[PDB]
Design an enzyme around this catalytic site. Structure first.
Site, PDB file in Angstrom:
ATOM      1  N   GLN A 184       0.813  -1.285   0.071  1.00 51.72           N
ATOM      2  CA  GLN A 184       0.017  -0.188   0.108  1.00 51.72           C
ATOM      3  C   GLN A 184       0.641   1.216   0.043  1.00 51.72           C
ATOM      4  O   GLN A 184       0.225   2.237  -0.353  1.00 51.72           O
ATOM      5  CB  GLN A 184      -0.912  -0.097   1.383  1.00 51.72           C
ATOM      6  CG  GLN A 184      -2.310  -0.690   1.296  1.00 51.72           C
ATOM      7  CD  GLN A 184      -2.811  -0.635   2.487  1.00 51.72           C
ATOM      8  OE1 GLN A 184      -2.859  -1.823   3.235  1.00 51.72           O
ATOM      9  NE2 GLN A 184      -3.562   0.495   2.883  1.00 51.72           N
ATOM     10  N   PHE A 201      -6.628  -3.090   2.794  1.00 49.16           N
ATOM     11  CA  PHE A 201      -7.402  -2.888   3.944  1.00 49.16           C
ATOM     12  C   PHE A 201      -6.797  -2.413   5.097  1.00 49.16           C
ATOM     13  O   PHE A 201      -7.233  -2.707   6.240  1.00 49.16           O
ATOM     14  CB  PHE A 201      -8.050  -4.253   4.081  1.00 49.16           C
ATOM     15  CG  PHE A 201      -9.057  -4.938   2.683  1.00 49.16           C
ATOM     16  CD1 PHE A 201      -8.432  -5.822   2.322  1.00 49.16           C
ATOM     17  CD2 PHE A 201     -10.148  -4.235   2.635  1.00 49.16           C
ATOM     18  CE1 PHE A 201      -8.986  -6.374   1.098  1.00 49.16           C
ATOM     19  CE2 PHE A 201     -10.614  -4.721   1.392  1.00 49.16           C
ATOM     20  CZ  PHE A 201     -10.240  -5.817   0.585  1.00 49.16           C
ATOM     21  N   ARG A 204      -7.607   8.398  16.023  1.00 52.12           N
ATOM     22  CA  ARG A 204      -8.882   8.154  14.992  1.00 52.12           C
ATOM     23  C   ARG A 204      -9.703   7.787  15.928  1.00 52.12           C
ATOM     24  O   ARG A 204     -11.068   8.322  15.619  1.00 52.12           O
ATOM     25  CB  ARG A 204      -8.453   7.416  13.920  1.00 52.12           C
ATOM     26  CG  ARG A 204      -9.579   7.668  12.773  1.00 52.12           C
ATOM     27  CD  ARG A 204      -9.037   7.132  11.390  1.00 52.12           C
ATOM     28  NE  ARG A 204      -8.391   8.284  10.932  1.00 52.12           N
ATOM     29  CZ  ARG A 204      -8.872   8.957  10.078  1.00 52.12           C
ATOM     30  NH1 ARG A 204     -10.101   9.181   9.839  1.00 52.12           N
ATOM     31  NH2 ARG A 204      -8.028  10.142   9.593  1.00 52.12           N
ATOM     32  N   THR A 260      -4.718  12.146   9.968  1.00 50.57           N
ATOM     33  CA  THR A 260      -4.584  12.283  11.557  1.00 50.57           C
ATOM     34  C   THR A 260      -3.519  13.037  11.448  1.00 50.57           C
ATOM     35  O   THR A 260      -3.256  14.368  11.892  1.00 50.57           O
ATOM     36  CB  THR A 260      -4.502  11.156  12.479  1.00 50.57           C
ATOM     37  OG1 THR A 260      -5.184   9.991  11.799  1.00 50.57           O
ATOM     38  CG2 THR A 260      -5.370  11.266  13.725  1.00 50.57           C
ATOM     39  N   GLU A 266     -12.819   4.076   3.388  1.00 47.18           N
ATOM     40  CA  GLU A 266     -13.055   4.016   4.886  1.00 47.18           C
ATOM     41  C   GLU A 266     -14.510   4.071   5.245  1.00 47.18           C
ATOM     42  O   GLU A 266     -15.143   3.178   5.761  1.00 47.18           O
ATOM     43  CB  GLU A 266     -12.305   4.609   5.850  1.00 47.18           C
ATOM     44  CG  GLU A 266     -10.784   3.995   5.724  1.00 47.18           C
ATOM     45  CD  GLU A 266      -9.679   4.624   6.578  1.00 47.18           C
ATOM     46  OE1 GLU A 266      -9.778   6.077   6.501  1.00 47.18           O
ATOM     47  OE2 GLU A 266      -8.654   4.213   6.768  1.00 47.18           O
TER      48      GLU A 266
HETATM   49  N1  XAX Z   1     -11.136  -3.577  -3.265  1.00 49.53           N
HETATM   50  C1  XAX Z   1     -10.598  -2.702  -2.234  1.00 49.53           C
HETATM   51  N2  XAX Z   1     -11.113  -1.704  -1.686  1.00 49.53           N
HETATM   52  C2  XAX Z   1     -10.701  -1.027  -0.818  1.00 49.53           C
HETATM   53  C3  XAX Z   1      -9.489  -1.599   0.006  1.00 49.53           C
HETATM   54  C4  XAX Z   1      -8.763  -2.753  -0.582  1.00 49.53           C
HETATM   55  O1  XAX Z   1      -7.600  -3.288  -0.195  1.00 49.53           O
HETATM   56  N3  XAX Z   1      -9.543  -3.330  -1.706  1.00 49.53           N
HETATM   57  N4  XAX Z   1      -8.861  -0.842   1.091  1.00 49.53           N
HETATM   58  C5  XAX Z   1      -9.391   0.341   1.452  1.00 49.53           C
HETATM   59  C6  XAX Z   1      -8.562   1.150   2.473  1.00 49.53           C
HETATM   60  S1  XAX Z   1      -7.863   0.592   3.656  1.00 49.53           S
HETATM   61 MO1  XAX Z   1      -6.631   2.522   4.953  1.00 49.53          MO
HETATM   62  O2  XAX Z   1      -6.128   4.077   5.902  1.00 49.53           O
HETATM   63  O3  XAX Z   1      -5.069   1.730   4.691  1.00 49.53           O
HETATM   64  S2  XAX Z   1      -6.770   1.318   6.688  1.00 49.53           S
HETATM   65  S3  XAX Z   1      -7.344   3.296   2.953  1.00 49.53           S
HETATM   66  C7  XAX Z   1      -8.342   2.476   1.900  1.00 49.53           C
HETATM   67  C8  XAX Z   1      -8.969   2.655   0.655  1.00 49.53           C
HETATM   68  C9  XAX Z   1      -8.073   3.424  -0.317  1.00 49.53           C
HETATM   69  O4  XAX Z   1      -8.540   3.933  -1.652  1.00 49.53           O
HETATM   70  P1  XAX Z   1      -8.567   5.429  -1.626  1.00 49.53           P
HETATM   71  O5  XAX Z   1      -9.879   5.813  -1.038  1.00 49.53           O
HETATM   72  O6  XAX Z   1      -7.379   5.901  -0.908  1.00 49.53           O
HETATM   73  O7  XAX Z   1      -8.335   5.684  -3.250  1.00 49.53           O
HETATM   74  O8  XAX Z   1     -10.319   2.305   0.322  1.00 49.53           O
HETATM   75  C10 XAX Z   1     -10.609   1.171   0.730  1.00 49.53           C
HETATM   76  N5  XAX Z   1     -11.306   0.265  -0.233  1.00 49.53           N
HETATM   77  O1  HPA Z   2      -6.339   7.894   8.534  1.00 50.91           O
HETATM   78  C1  HPA Z   2      -5.064   7.438   8.883  1.00 50.91           C
HETATM   79  N1  HPA Z   2      -5.471   5.989   8.019  1.00 50.91           N
HETATM   80  C2  HPA Z   2      -4.165   5.639   7.880  1.00 50.91           C
HETATM   81  N2  HPA Z   2      -2.902   5.790   8.249  1.00 50.91           N
HETATM   82  C3  HPA Z   2      -2.871   6.997   9.272  1.00 50.91           C
HETATM   83  N3  HPA Z   2      -1.794   7.507   9.700  1.00 50.91           N
HETATM   84  C4  HPA Z   2      -2.350   8.768  10.237  1.00 50.91           C
HETATM   85  N4  HPA Z   2      -3.518   8.867  10.126  1.00 50.91           N
HETATM   86  C5  HPA Z   2      -4.130   7.902   9.407  1.00 50.91           C
END
Ligand code: XAX
Ligand code: HPA
Ligand SMILES: Cc1cc2nc3c(=O)[nH]c(=O)nc-3n(C[C@H](O)[C@H](O)[C@H](O)COP(=O)(O)OP(=O)(O)OC[C@H]3O[C@@H](n4cnc5c(N)ncnc54)[C@H](O)[C@@H]3O)c2cc1C
Ligand code: FES
Ligand code: FES
Ligand SMILES: [Ba+2]
Lengths: 760, 450
Positions: free
Chosen positions: A196, A227, A309, A443, A713
């Site tokens: 990631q 995730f 958070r 954050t 999220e």
């Molecule tokens: N298909 C799919 N969708 C997913 C995920 C995935 O693994 N697979 N992961 C997330 C997570 S988990 Mo986090 O802060 O790292 S804890 S951020 C994040 C995320 C990342 O996508 P943006 O919004 O940044 O473009 O959407 C979600 N949708």
């Molecule tokens: O909101 C968050 N998501 C993932 N990592 C982070 N580190 C600080 N804030 C965040």
């Protein structure tokens, strides 16, 4: 292109098997494969380590001790150290003590077990109660944030409800496990990994090898899921690979097996929440008092920002005049818990949703009405604030819930169940609504920057490259749709490159739902620059102001004449105008004091609501969702279809965390649920039999990419709905308070029915 | 040793020198990178392939499948679903349209899994796709897709595989097996391989002397006998479930939730029995309907009731050279019911498996056959509870009055899948359920309509 329901960037390449992930990738005939040797002791000094039978195992080319590591034995995302290979002692069952390098993956896994290790075991911190009693915690004390005086509100609150409930962990179960390949491209290295966050992989590898950052290059095309798991726990394999590559002179690849993966790497912080919530005779909350006990594990990882958070989202969706959280960062000799979709938000928000519900039942009021009565005020002289004191003037939850309950036929169905309940004596139905208010942004606020790099080739066709990484959220699709939108060209003409540290440097993690927001802006910057270049050139060549050169539908128009986008680029090539631009973006308005618990951490919040219906068997506790009605706010969605999908799956995963997914350790810190056989994520037939996901379409108040709203999220927190509906089912059994726990497994469900009924 | 098969249209021959190398292994090693790895425990169908033979087309996990099993078959992997000209299977398109993809990992598995459903014209996607799991999308997009892909005609190129063919012992006749197994007692027998391959992939174990019973048609037989039905030890669960549909709608209902459709096609009844699991879901059903097992020590034939086969944990009434040949279950058993209980419904290890089957004579209980899985370290019938029920009224209160006797029949265990208290508690709960369901009460949670 923006705002179209276009398909995922690899949907065809996906569906035909030709999409290639790390282990799929071709590589040299001499590529060695690595395996960790894992500690079987929870808290011990390693006083004997005979790796003689390991080295003698066949296929084995190299076998590594912490002592062998040339530089920095650290993988931790924190400034707090976390070794890769154990240093003198072990801290949890599953800690890599050593590293095999063998001619086959199979061979190394075999040799990993052949180790002769003698531990000198010490007492071990395993439960929160122990950690807290033994002062086994992080940051040196709890974090304490207070808005007003809770104690004084609860003193003379007309209605007050107190409770204490457990919230279990959550394994990631990304279908592609943790993976990395190191390639010793002379001088430095090249790392390919299912990560990631390529730029921290760079940072961590660099340090482990001892070469300046310009010598480590990280490429990343895709992941089989992220995730939060891949947001840091990549460092270990990517260090292991580069260190063995350096030493063996060969390219070294490493991937965990599912058994390794769950044992070695960390999950979602399990919490315990004590709540003291009070209201008046009208229903308006007088204040809530929270205590968080967080299961951070043997190492920091991302435990610090995670629990920040949790505390930030301790307001759920409601205005509270006096709010106090006392958040404990406890250490235990278990896996170092990490990031997971929601990043702690789910945990703090659930404690508010459990408190508000327990208050509702107590004063005998309908929770939906009590929640409606206690939302943040809708926008349009003093705007309400949160407990950290951020103005909330983008809250549409008034309208949204009203919109959803009407479309979901909420009142009729809840009355329809009342009758169904009185007809049944073995089966009970439940139904609950749950709101979502989730702050968008990092954050830690300096991570709020994204970068891009766009090429325009002489045949017209462009090459897109940003810092965000593909785990399935359809990030590149949105970037392609933005890129094509800005240049006024078909999205076909836009090609996406693999994420590169050498293309876009100093990336953050693709986390906090920010990915699409900031990179969208990054892409847009480079695209606008290029589009400006072409416009300026035309208006010179055609005599006029650049403003009047319109780029649209793959066609350029100026002077009342028209060319194809292709024709204009080639000419600007011939003119010697640069067709390569970088694009950058850093999120505005962000400023807050973590230790104070004051300021504006977030640019905005993402809203939604979910109504869930469930059934429970009173005899055994067996359960299942029957229907789900979601109305999530995506602002002006970048991709309607992609968003709707995210929200579907985020909910299914959300509910999965509060239902059948359960993490279990024995009396020795051994993870008993370390395979798919014993960890039960939601399987096909578990899908809400009637699944209505609808969007809330209203442009973002803030200046985000095409009025969009980060949809990663937030819609995870919709799963609460199902947990509450399951509790609503239990409430229907007896006159007593069920005290349902997370996760609500058939056993934990029965135990709540049992309480309501008044048994044991 | 040489075996041949049909790999994605091409005719391929292979030299077996390691008999225990999975099919997932072979393919990825060969280059067929489209088949993925998820765990090598069979649970996530990330490697669902398609095989075909005289029987028809079936969807299986390549990670449980040893090569000498696909001998003579027709194999289709993900990279071979689409038409040779380049046109996508109606399944692939529908999955593109209805966004059945996010990370794309489980996609190959589903595609193959859906394609085989599409081919055999199957529609119970709930049970059909329960094998391959996805973290990403929530299945709703896949379910829309599969329904849209349903309307389109079958893939005529996949159909073309049907015409095909029309060191490590592989028997062809049941005699030839007893013949060989008479001289090789310490020989590792592989039927479906859904438990033996978890010793090679996960437990990492070497096993010379191997024999694939998955090539003995006379051992895999449904046959009707005067007394009831003679099911051979080679009969696959999918088929056993398919056969039960008529005579035993209750057994079929349990077998619905036996592993996944992927594993049910290759996992056998006599394999499950000869495995000897206490959390084994086959036995308790067969034991509650009093089905006699059958063994073979060459030309020898023992025929004991199945409950007698299981003595201690990991210790069975197997003699050196003896093997499970067939089972015999009487024609009708209208009073039989099976209750599986686990964290999740589909594909999980049951914490308590409740099998109850009584007769009436008006109101008085005649013959009680109450049997349990997972309650004590061997699938056994509950004696103290059973002896109490016989010759009594069939009302809730009387059945509730003998429930504590189960706590003398068993003293359950407490693992990650249930606390003994609850395991014991649910066992008792299944008896009240039985009296309620039979009286016509709404007890089943799965049968409720939204
Ligand atoms: N298909 C799919 N969708 C997913 C995920 C995935 O693994 N697979 N992961 C997330 C997570 S988990 Mo986090 O802060 O790292 S804890 S951020 C994040 C995320 C990342 O996508 P943006 O919004 O940044 O473009 O959407 C979600 N949708
Ligand atoms: O909101 C968050 N998501 C993932 N990592 C982070 N580190 C600080 N804030 C965040
Ligand atoms: C993903 C997965 C899901 C599963 N789900 C379930 C489930 O839901 N319920 C359940 O009860 N089990 C389940 N199992 C385990 C179960 O033991 C096997 O999958 C199956 O029931 C055994 O049948 P098989 O044909 O695969 O036998 P094999 O796995 O081939 O054989 C297992 C053992 O039995 C012996 N054996 C097989 N046939 C004979 C014979 N004819 N004569 C003598 N010995 C023989 C073999 O030598 C071996 O020792 C599951 C396993 C997996 C990997
Ligand atoms: S390896 Fe995951 S099921 Fe075949
Ligand atoms: S699409 Fe991500 S796992 Fe199925
Ligand atoms: Ba993990």
């Amino acid at each position: 292109s923006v705002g179209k329901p276009l398909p995922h960037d690899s949907a065809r390449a996906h569906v035909t098997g030709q999409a290639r992930y790390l282990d799929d990738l071709p590589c040299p005939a001499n590529t060695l494969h690595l395996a960790f040797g894992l500690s079987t002791e929870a808290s011990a000094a390693i006083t004997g380590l005979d790796l003689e039978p390991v080295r003698e195992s066949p296929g084995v080319i190299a076998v590594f001790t912490a002592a062998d590591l040339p530089h920095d034995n650290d993988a931790s995302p924190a400034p707090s150290p976390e070794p890769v290979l154990a240093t003198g002692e072990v801290h949890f069952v599953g800690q890599p003590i050593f590293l095999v390098a063998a001619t086959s993956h199979r061979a190394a896994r075999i040799a990993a077990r052949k180790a002769r290790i003698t531990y000198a075991p010490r007492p071990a911190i395993l439960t929160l109660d122990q950690a807290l009693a033994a002062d086994s915690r992080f940051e040196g004390g709890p974090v304490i944030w207070a808005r007003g005086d809770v104690e004084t509100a609860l003193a003379g609150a007309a209605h007050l409800a107190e409770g204490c409930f457990e919230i279990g962990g959550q394994e990631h179960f990304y279908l592609e496990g943790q993976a990395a390949l190191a390639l010793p491209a002379e001088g430095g290295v090249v790392i390919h990994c299912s990560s990631q966050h390529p730029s921290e992989i760079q940072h961590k590898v660099a340090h482990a090898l001892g070469l300046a950052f310009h010598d480590v290059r990280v490429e990343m095309r895709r992941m089989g899921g992220g995730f939060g798991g891949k947001q840091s726990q990549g460092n270990h394999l990517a260090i292991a690979c580069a260190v063995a590559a350096r030493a063996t002179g060969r390219p070294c690849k490493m991937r965990y097996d599912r058994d390794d993966d769950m044992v070695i790497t960390g999950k979602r912080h399990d919490f315990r929440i004590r709540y003291r919530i009070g209201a008046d005779a009208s229903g308006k909350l007088l204040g809530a008092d929270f205590v968080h006990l967080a299961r951070c594990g043997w190492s920091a990882d991302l435990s610090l920002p995670v629990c920040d958070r949790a505390m930030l989202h301790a307001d759920g969706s409601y205005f509270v005049p006096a709010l106090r959280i006392e958040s404990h960062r406890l250490r235990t000799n278990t896996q170092s818990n990490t990031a997971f979709r929601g990043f702690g938000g789910p945990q703090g928000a659930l404690g508010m949703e459990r408190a508000i519900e327990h208050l509702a039942r107590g004063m005998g009021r309908d929770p939906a009405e009590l929640r409606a009565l206690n939302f943040y005020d809708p926008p349009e002289k003093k705007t309400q604030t949160t407990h950290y004191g951020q103005e909330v003037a983008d809250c549409v939850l008034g309208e949204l819930v009203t919109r959803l309950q009407k479309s979901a036929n909420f009142t009729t169905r809840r009355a329809e169940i009342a009758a169904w309940n009185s007809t049944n004596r073995t089966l009970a139905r439940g139904i609950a609504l749950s709101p979502v208010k989730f702050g968008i942004s990092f954050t830690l606020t300096h991570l709020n920057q994204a970068g891009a790099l766009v090429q325009i080739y002489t045949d017209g066709s462009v090459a897109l490259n940003h810092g965000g990484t593909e785990m399935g959220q359809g990030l590149h699709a949105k970037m392609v749709q933005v890129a094509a939108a800005v240049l006024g060209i078909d999205p076909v003409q836009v090609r996406i490159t693999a994420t590169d540290t050498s293309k876009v440097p100093n990336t953050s993690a693709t986390a906090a739902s920010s990915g699409a927001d900031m990179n969208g802006m990054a892409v847009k910057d480079a695209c606008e620059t290029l589009r400006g270049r072409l416009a300026g050139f035309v208006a010179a060549r055609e005599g006029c102001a650049a403003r009047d050169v319109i780029f649209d539908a793959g066609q350029v128009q100026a002077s009342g004449k028209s060319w194809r986008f292709a024709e204009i680029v080639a000419a600007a090539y011939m003119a010697r105008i640069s067709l390569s631009a970088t694009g950058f973006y850093a999120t505005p308005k962000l400023s807050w004091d973590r230790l104070r618990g004051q300021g504006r951490p977030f640019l905005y919040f993402a809203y939604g609501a979910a109504i869930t219906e469930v059934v429970i068997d009173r005899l055994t506790g067996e359960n299942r969702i029957l229907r789900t009605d979601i109305l999530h706010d995506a602002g002006a969605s970048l991709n309607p279809a992609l968003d709707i999908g995210q929200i579907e799956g985020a909910y299914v995963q959300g509910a999965g965390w509060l239902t059948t997914e359960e993490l279990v350790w024995d009396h020795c810190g051994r993870l008993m649920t370390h395979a798919p056989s014993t960890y039960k994520i939601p399987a096909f037939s578990d899908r809400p039999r009637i699944f209505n996901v609808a969007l809330w379409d209203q442009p973002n108040r803030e200046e985000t990419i095409f009025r969009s709203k980060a949809v990663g999220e937030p819609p995870f927190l919709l799963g609460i709905s199902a947990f509450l509906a399951l509790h609503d089912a239990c409430a229907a059994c007896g006159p007593h308070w069920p005290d349902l726990q997370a996760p609500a497994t058939p056993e934990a469900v029965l135990a709540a029915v049992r309480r309501a009924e008044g048994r044991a | 040793m040489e075996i041949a098969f049909l790999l994605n249209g091409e005719t391929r021959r292979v030299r077996i020198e390691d008999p225990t190398q999975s099919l997932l292994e072979w393919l990825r090693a060969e280059g067929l990178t489209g088949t993925k790895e998820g765990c090598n425990e069979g649970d996530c169908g990330a490697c669902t392939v398609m095989i075909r033979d005289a029987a028809g087309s079936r969807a299986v996990n390549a990670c449980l499948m040893m090569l000498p099993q696909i001998a003579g078959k027709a194999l289709r992997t993900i990279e071979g679903i689409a038409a040779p000209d380049g046109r996508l299977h109606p399944v692939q398109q529908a999955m593109i349209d209805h966004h059945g993809s996010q990370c794309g990992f489980c996609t190959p598995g589903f595609i193959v899994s859906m394609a085989a459903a599409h081919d055999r014209d199957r529609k119970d996607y709930d049970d059909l796709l329960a094998g391959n799991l996805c973290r990403c999308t929530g299945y709703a997009p896949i379910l829309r897709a599969a329904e849209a892909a349903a309307g389109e005609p079958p893939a005529d190129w996949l159909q073309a595989d049907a015409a095909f063919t029309l060191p490590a012992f592989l028997p062809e006749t049941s005699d030839a097996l007893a013949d060989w197994y008479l001289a090789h007692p310490e020989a590792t027998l592989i039927a479906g391989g859904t438990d033996v391959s978890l010793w090679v992939t996960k437990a990492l174990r070497d096993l010379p002397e191997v024999a694939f019973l998955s090539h003995c048609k006379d051992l895999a037989q449904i046959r009707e006998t005067p007394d009831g039905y003679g099911i051979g030890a080679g009969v696959t669960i999918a088929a056993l479930r398919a056969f039960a549909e008529g005579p035993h709608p209750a057994l079929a209902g349990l077998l619905r939730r036996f592993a996944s459709e992927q594993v049910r096609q290759v996992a056998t009844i006599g394999g499950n029995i000869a495995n000897g699991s206490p959390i084994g879901d086959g036995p308790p059903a067969l034991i509650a309907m009093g089905a006699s097992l059958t063994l073979r020590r060459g030309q020898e034939r023992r025929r004991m009731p199945l409950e007698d086969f299981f003595l201690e944990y990991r210790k069975q009434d197997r003699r050196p050279g003896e093997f499970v040949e067939s089972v015999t279950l009487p024609k009708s058993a209208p009073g039989l019911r099976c209750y599986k209980l686990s964290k999740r419904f589909d594909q999980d290890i049951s914490a308590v498996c409740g099998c109850l089957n009584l007769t009436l004579k008006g109101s008085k209980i005649e013959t009680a056959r109450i049997a349990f899985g997972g309650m004590a370290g061997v699938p056994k019938r509950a004696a103290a509870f059973e002896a109490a029920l016989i010759g009594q009224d069939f009302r809730e209160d009387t059945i509730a009055a003998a429930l504590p006797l189960l706590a003398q029949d068993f003293t359950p265990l407490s693992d990650m899948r249930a606390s003994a208290a609850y395991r014991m508690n649910a066992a008792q709960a299944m008896a009240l359920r039985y009296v309620r369901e039979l009286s016509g009460e709404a007890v089943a949670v799965l049968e409720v309509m939204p």
